[PDB]
């Protein structure tokens, strides 16, 4: 079925809060119809299928997320299901045109290695960039704390998008690093391929 927006995370010193928008039954029904008439807000949508849930981050008018979560699915939308605009499997990256009410981040251009990861619980945590697509979590947390956060954003100090969260690098259930899809992969995708 379609990917469905089931809530959102709204970003503010970077802070975040979350709001629910859909229940489980409506999530299921909307998945089958592909028709979502709800108002959209915020930079980050909580999204779900009938089987799994994760995050999507809007950067420059596109809502991006992970292929391992969204596969090839449409996004439920006010005029019916929205076909993916970009589908990059090797990069594990898909995007739909942002629903109109959604608020876009703009890509980071400052090059800071001081990042923040916004989690599915709307907690904002410090990450130090170590390369194109990895950052260490400066305060290691159980991997459970990061469950549901796939597709959420990494931000620089100025609140611009650095990337989207892909997987945790863990030893013994403790997340010490994250793996992320760089914002450069999004621009390479929009070129491009």
């Amino acid at each position: 079925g379609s990917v469905v927006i089931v809530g959102r995370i709204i970003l503010s010193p970077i802070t975040a809060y979350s709001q629910q928008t859909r229940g489980l039954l409506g999530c299921i029904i909307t998945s089958l119809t592909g028709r979502d008439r709800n108002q959209v807000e915020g930079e980050v949508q909580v999204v779900s299928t009938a089987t799994q849930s994760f995050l999507a981050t809007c950067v420059n008018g596109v809502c991006w997320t992970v292929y391992h979560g969204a596969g090839s699915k449409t996004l439920a939308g006010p005029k019916g299901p929205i076909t993916q605009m970009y589908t990059n499997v090797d990069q594990d990256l898909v995007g739909w045109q942002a629903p109109p009410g959604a608020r876009s981040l703009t890509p980071c251009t400052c090059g800071s290695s001081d990042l923040y990861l916004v989690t599915r619980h709307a907690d904002v945590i410090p990450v130090r960039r170590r390369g194109d697509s990895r950052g260490s979590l400066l305060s290691p947390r159980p991997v459970s704390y990061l469950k549901g956060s796939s597709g959420g954003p990494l931000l620089c100090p100025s609140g611009h998008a650095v990337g989207i969260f892909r997987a945790a690098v863990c030893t013994r259930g403790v997340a010490k690093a994250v793996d992320f899809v760089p914002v450069e992969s999004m621009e390479t995708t929009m070129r491009g391929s």
């Binding site: 849930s53 997987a167 945790a168 690093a177």
Partner: peptide, 17 residues
């Protein structure tokens, strides 16, 4: 350490048992 993927169950706040 190993890569761990982080999908959760269906819905805004997925039910765990």
């Amino acid at each position: 350490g190993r890569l761990v993927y982080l999908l959760d169950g269906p819905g805004y706040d997925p039910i765990h048992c």
